[PDB]
Design a binder for this molecule. Sequence first.
Ligand SMILES: Cc1cc2nc3c(=O)[nH]c(=O)nc-3n(C[C@H](O)[C@H](O)[C@H](O)COP(=O)(O)OP(=O)(O)OC[C@H]3O[C@@H](n4cnc5c(N)ncnc54)[C@H](O)[C@@H]3O)c2cc1C
Length: 368
Amino acid sequence: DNHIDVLINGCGIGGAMLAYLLGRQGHRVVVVEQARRERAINGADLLKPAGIRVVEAAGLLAEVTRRGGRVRHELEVYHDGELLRYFNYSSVDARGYFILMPCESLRRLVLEKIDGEATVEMLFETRIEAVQRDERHAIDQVRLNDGRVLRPRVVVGADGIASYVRRRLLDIDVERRPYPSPMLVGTFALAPCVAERNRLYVDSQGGLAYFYPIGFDRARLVVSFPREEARELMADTRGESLRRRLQRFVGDESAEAIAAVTGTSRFKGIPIGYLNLDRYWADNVAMLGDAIHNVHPITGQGMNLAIEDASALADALDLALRDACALEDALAGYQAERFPVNQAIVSYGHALATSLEDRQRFAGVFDT
Ligand SMILES: Cc1cc2nc3c(=O)[nH]c(=O)nc-3n(C[C@H](O)[C@H](O)[C@H](O)COP(=O)(O)OP(=O)(O)OC[C@H]3O[C@@H](n4cnc5c(N)ncnc54)[C@H](O)[C@@H]3O)c2cc1C
């Protein structure tokens, strides 16, 4: 009646994909999102092979490239201007390729599919107000800020790095530790060199610049420098100090990409955390994506891991909701499958970010 299978807090890329996968299975899903639907959150751009498998299982892979997603299989990494590593991800495995696809492009696609799933109801500009638990400490009722009351079998935090579900429903507090270098991303015209190949540049002074195409006709430039330097560089908004700083460690192959940086004003900061929560669930409440882990954005994997979590959670929840197994066993299974994968990328990110300056150490991180 007001009984539903799953109440998903947050309709980000993780939450959307979980809602679609559950809705495809005929589960009764309510998604609560505080923002308006059209609010575009720019975000990560990368899908790695495991994420691509989810997209492919959702029936979405063709539409990803039709909407500007790009299949790639190479990366060059430079340190102090010289090539350190070249990676061909498909040299052994034809499916080793990755995809560049803006988070918001993929989320809009998924939302279009949800629009046709009659068992899913998406509520925008809506928030959870209060919950009630039963004698077994499972949430049994949820009231929303519009006055709507629901009775869900399962509550999911897909609500991102400041997860309400984590903080308020599970009462978990997370220590922060900021990094000393921020990371910022800007969008520019696309140079032939960027269209050709992804190139990452780092230097012994702690500079980083990563150039890669996005969409049909744009390029990203992701940069990082120590905080005060980064501030000075972004202050000069016609961009001359940044172009010059890039020229110190970015060689001729990417000269046109550097010339494409006409200004600094549309650079955006990127969140940087370090987390992998030792529990992904309690009672009938589970979490995914940035609610449970924060990887250094140097890895590129924030969206990708949210999508991998979503798929594993949809599998585990489908089992529970079908009565193939007890919810606690299904949630325990979700955690065992995801935790080691998320942990490895969280460790890898931190190892990469802290080893920039040291050419040998940085190459060693790539290899291991
Ligand atoms: C500009 C930008 C650049 C980025 N670049 C990178 C990068 O280069 N590499 C990288 O690895 N990662 C990057 N990230 C991080 C990456 O986008 C995220 O890791 C990814 O989106 C996580 O997906 P998620 O579904 O878990 O959460 P999110 O995509 O954060 O989605 C959470 C959703 O929950 C909603 N929400 C939050 N609180 C509530 C509430 N109380 N009630 C209801 N709804 C709520 C939010 O509005 C949002 O829609 C970037 C992020 C930003 C914003």
